[PDB]
């Protein structure tokens, strides 16, 4: 089917490869073409899409995964639904948010992440899945104002039936800017599936921060900024992050104007419960989901 | 609701209190009257029945918990379904088993234990529950040849809605005869919920041993004996058990004649995989259920 996709324009590009707006069967599609060095991620994401029943409103839906030759060389493609509003990263720089829009975004993400983390038994079930590269560029905004989570190339899996933690075999590591302290300082218990969920929760708190900044209260709003924008450069090194997060113990600042708004007050408390040093102390995805469902 | 029951005969009495066949609305019921020293166990088990949807064919069904004044003293009652075949401890002493009835017993136990251990979500859900006092006296035999698990007095609970382990406040500790190595040597990670499930699997392996001895093969069967009958006395001390299980690494002996019967050969393997010194190496309850489902 890759043969029948017309590529229209590149809408994203990095070390991972490229993403194109494509045309297939009269519809827009997104086509990720992986770079020659990220093949293990293609393989992992193709694995999940072909073996795990993983359909959910807030998880990017796959159309197909192909191996195609483009002028005497094999490319690995992932074809998915196309979301014209773009990633959450771009969207937040192009608009501000009201309370309703802000809460739909962060609840839809929590709902997606809770569905990954929870094992489902029986016929149409799935193992537990930790994401491990959660960030605002890996979240797409839908026209209905909810989001969906993309990029399963680092997923780890677990099934209670087995002692079996399925970590794959991918040299890729998570985005440094969003790595939790226990990943930066290499004390993460790599044999414990729960450790990976607590890493997703750390990174979720950062996304929550990023989105809350863009909700208007009392007529004012903060500029879009990425986590730790003030203390690390662009493309921060491993050591930059370790210094800020581990040695200096820093966390994103809460703007004072948030305390004059009850929603932002509740989101401030929530995000700080994603950031405890002790990974065991952090909220679960399901607790976040429930809490955001009650926030008004 | 304790006034609506008439106690007819005491069918058991020990350190824990007493159990009575009572009469209620045309049916037998079991009435456990707790001893004064075991008040916290009544409280825990009343806490569970009041806060947890716990219904399963292989878990002793509760009718009510009540406080009542008899003899000018307060008795704490737990009123359950009654099983005239008695506990597994009684039944194994009354009779021998054929292959079908042996597998029906130990499968149904695995099935109840798996159900305790697994967390269920939604409106029909429940937290994960570890039992902590599993033994043949805490398992009742039903007329249909299946069993149900009793005695949640030491239960510990866990759910994906909170990273806090819900332990009791109960000084009571499990039956020493069945305690796992990591309990006896006090190396159990008291903060990790998984380690309490692993304690149940140790004990389940011991129950499996007791049941297996009573399955006849090629006209051979063993007398009923409790685990470790040959190396500790009745009512063994904590040291008695630690010397056998930890210091000497002893394990219940496998009768040679089991290796002449394919079923008992499969049961011997399954026991072994319950008895590893390393708790994390042990099978899960769900994998035991699945294995016993496929053993013929
Ligand atoms: O980039 C995408 C996109 C990417 C994936 C995708 C597929 C496979 N793997 C991924 C891993 C990480 C993140 C995304 C994917 C799936 C669907 C997608 N729909 C849309 N756009 C996208 C479309 C437009 C835009 N502009 C930029 C800012 O606003 C206006 C237009 C920016 C992004
Ligand atoms: O003891 C029971 C029994 C106990 C519970 C029960 C309720 C609440 N908590 C518990 C905690 C641990 C164990 C059991 C319970 C529930 C149902 C029960 N049905 C039957 N008998 C029982 C009845 C008779 C006998 N003999 C065996 C020897 O030949 C004479 C009869 C032995 C046991």
* Contact check, Cβ <8 Å, A284/B163: yes
Q: Which tokens belong to B225?
A: 């004996």
Whole-number Å distance between alpha carbons of A132 and A134: 6
d(CA A60, CA B160): 24
Q: Which of A214, A198, A213 is nearest to A253 (CA)?
A: A213
Q: What angle do CA B230, B232, B235 make, to 5 degrees?
A: 125
Residue contact A118–B161, C-beta within 8 A: no
Q: CA B1: distance to chain centroid?
A: 27
Task: Give the separation between CA B40 and CA B133, rounded to whole angstroms.
Answer: 15
Known catalytic residue at A133: yes
Ligand 2 in reach of B82 Cβ (< 6 A)? yes
Q: Which residues of A lie closer than 8 Å to B, measured between beta carbons?
A: 117-118, 121, 160-163, 280-287, 290
- Give CA angle at A234 (A228, A198), nearest 5°: 45
Let me know: does B146 contact B57? Beta carbons within 8 Å: yes
Alpha-carbon gap, residue A224 to B270, rounded angstroms: 58
**A263 and A99 Cβ atoms separated by less than 8 Å:** yes
Instruction: For the beta carbon of residue A74, count every other beta carbon within 10 angstroms.
Output: 10
Nearest Cα neighbor of B70 from B16, B30, B18, B24 is B18
Q: Which ligand sits closest to the CA of B19?
A: 2
For the CA of A139, the nearest atom of ligand 1: 13
CA distance A3 to A1: 5
The closest of A203, A186, A184, A193 to A156, measured between CA atoms, is A193
Tell whether ligand 1 has an atom less than 6 A from the beta carbon of residue A54: no
Distance between the two ends of chain A, CA-based, in angstroms? 45
Output the CA torsion A270→A271→A272→A278 (10° steps): 100
Q: Are strands A74-81 and B17-24 parallel, antiparallel or unpaired?
A: unpaired
Per-residue CA distances from A14 to A8, A19, A51, A190, B250 (Å):
18, 9, 28, 28, 59
A140, A141, A148, A151, best to mutate for ligand 1 pocket (most atoms within 8 Å of CB): A140
Q: Which residues contact B235 (CB under 8 A, 6 or more apart)?
A: none
Helix axes B285-294, B262-272, angle to 10 degrees: 170
Residue with tokens 């962060």: A106
Ligand 1 pocket: which of A87, A89, A95, A131 to mutate (most atoms within 8 A of CB) = A87
Specify whether the CB–CB gap between A204 and A108 falls below 8 A: no
Closest ligand to Cα A133: 1
User: Which positions of B are annotated as active-site residues?
Assistant: 133
Q: Do B284 and A161 touch (CB under 8 A)?
A: yes
N-term to C-term CA, chain B: 45
Q: Is the CB of A19 under 6 A from ligand 1?
A: yes
Neighbours of A113 (CB within 10 A): 29
Which technique was used to obtain these atomic coordinates? X-ray
Q: How many helical (H) and strand (E) elements, i.e. helices and strands, does chain B have? A: 8, 10
**Whether residue B83 has its Cβ less than 6 Å from ligand 2:** yes
Token output for A272:
């700080």
Q: Give the whole-angstrom CA distance, residue B125 versus residue A125.
A: 16
Contacts of B165 (CB under 8 A, 6+ apart): B156, B157, B158, B191, B192, B193
From the CA of B79, the nearest ligand is: 2
Say whether B162 and A280 touch across the interface (CB within 8 A): no
Min Cα separation A66/chain B (Å) = 35
Q: Tell the residue nearest (CA) to atom 12 of ligand 1.
A: A138
Smallest Cα distance from A287 to chain B, Å? 5
Question: Of A197, A199, A198, A209, which is closest to residue A105 (Cα–Cα)?
Answer: A209
Conformational region of residue A38, where left means phi above 0, alpha means psi within -120 to 50, and beta covers everything else: alpha
Contacts of B289 (CB under 8 A, 6+ apart): B107, B110, B111, B114
Domains (ranges, CATH) in chain A?
1-84 (3.30.200.20), 85-296 (1.10.510.10)
- Coil, helix or strand for B21? strand
| A128 vs A149: CA distance, rounded Å | 16
Q: Give the separation between CA B292 and CA B106, rounded to whole angstroms.
A: 8
Q: What's the gap in Å between A147 CA and the centre of ligand 1?
A: 12
Is B160 in contact with A290 (Cβ distance < 8 A)? no
Judging contacts by C-beta atoms under 8 Å, the chain A residues touching residue B162 are 284, 287
Query: Residues with Cβ < 8 Å from A14, sequence gap 6 or more?
Result: none
How many Å apart are CA A191 and CA B153, to the nearest integer?
32
Cβ-based neighbours of B100, under 8 Å, separated by 6 or more: none
For residue B33, the surrounding DSSP H or E stretch is strand B27-34
Q: Indicate which residue of A38, A90, A133, A248 is catalytic.
A: A133
Q: How many CA atoms lie within 13 A of B123 on its CB side?
A: 0
Q: Which DSSP symbol is given to B246? A: I
Residue with tokens 């007398």: B223
Per residue, what are the HEC states of chain A?
Answer: CHHHCEEEEEEEEECCEEEEEEEECCEEEEEEEECCCCHHHHHHHHHHHHHCCCCCCCECCEEEEEEEECCCCEEEEEEEECCCCCEHHHHHHHCCECHHHHHHHHHHHHHHHHHHHCCECCCCCECEEECCCCCHHHEEECCCCCEEECCCCCCEEECCCCCCEECCCCCCCCCHHHCCHHHHCCCCCCCCHHHHHHHHHHHHHHHHHHHHCCECECCECCCCCCCCCCCCCCCCCHHHHHHHHHHCCCCCCCCHHHHHCHHHHHHHHHHHCCCCCCHHHCCCHHHHHHHHHHCC
Are the beta carbons of B126 and B53 closer than 8 angstroms?
yes
Let me know the angle formed at the C-alpha of B186 by B250 and A279, rounded to the nearest 5 degrees: 125
Q: How far is the CA of A27 from the centre of ligand 1 (A)?
A: 15
Nearest to B215 by CA among B103, B101, B106, B97: B97
Torsion of CA B210, B146, B17, B75, to 10 degrees: 170
Contact B117, B129 (CB under 8 A): yes
């Amino acid at each position: 089917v890759a043969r029948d996709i017309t590529l229209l324009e590149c809408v994203g590009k990095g070390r991972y490869g490229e993403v194109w707006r494509g045309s297939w069967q009269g519809e827009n599609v997104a086509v990720k073409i992986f770079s020659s060095r990220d093949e293990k991620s293609w393989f992992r994401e193709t694995e999940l899409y072909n073996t795990v029943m993983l359909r959910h409103e807030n998880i990017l839906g796959f159309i197909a995964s192909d191996m195609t030759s483009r002028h005497s060389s094999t490319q690995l493609w992932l074809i998915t639904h196309y979301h014209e509003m773009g990633s959450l990263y771009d969207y937040l720089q192009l608009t501000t948010l009201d309370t309703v829009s802000c809460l739909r975004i962060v609840l839809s993400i929590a709902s997606g992440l809770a569905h990954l983390h929870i094992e489902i038994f029986g016929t149409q079930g799935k193992p537990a899945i930790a994401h491990r590269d959660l960030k605002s560029k890996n979240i797409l905004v839908k026209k209905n104002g909810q989001c969906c989570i993309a990029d399963l190339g680092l997923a780890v899996m677990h099934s209670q039936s087995t002692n079996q933690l399925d970590v794959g075999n991918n040299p890729r590591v998570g985005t440094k800017r969003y790595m939790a302290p226990e990943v930066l300082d290499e004390t993460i218990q790599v044999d414990c599936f729960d450790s990976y969920k607590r890493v997703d929760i750390w990174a979720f708190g950062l996304v929550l921060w990023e989105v809350a900044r863009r909700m208007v209260s009392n007529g004012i709003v903060e500029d879009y900024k990425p986590p730790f924008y003030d203390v690390v450069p662009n493309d921060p090194s491993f050591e930059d992050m370790r210094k800020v997060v581990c040695v200096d113990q820093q966390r994103p600042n809460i703007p004072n104007r948030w305390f004059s708004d009850p929603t932002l007050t509740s989101l401030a408390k929530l995000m700080k419960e994603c950031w405890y040093q002790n990974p065991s102390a952090r909220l679960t995805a399901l607790r976040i989901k429930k809490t955001l469902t009650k926030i008004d």
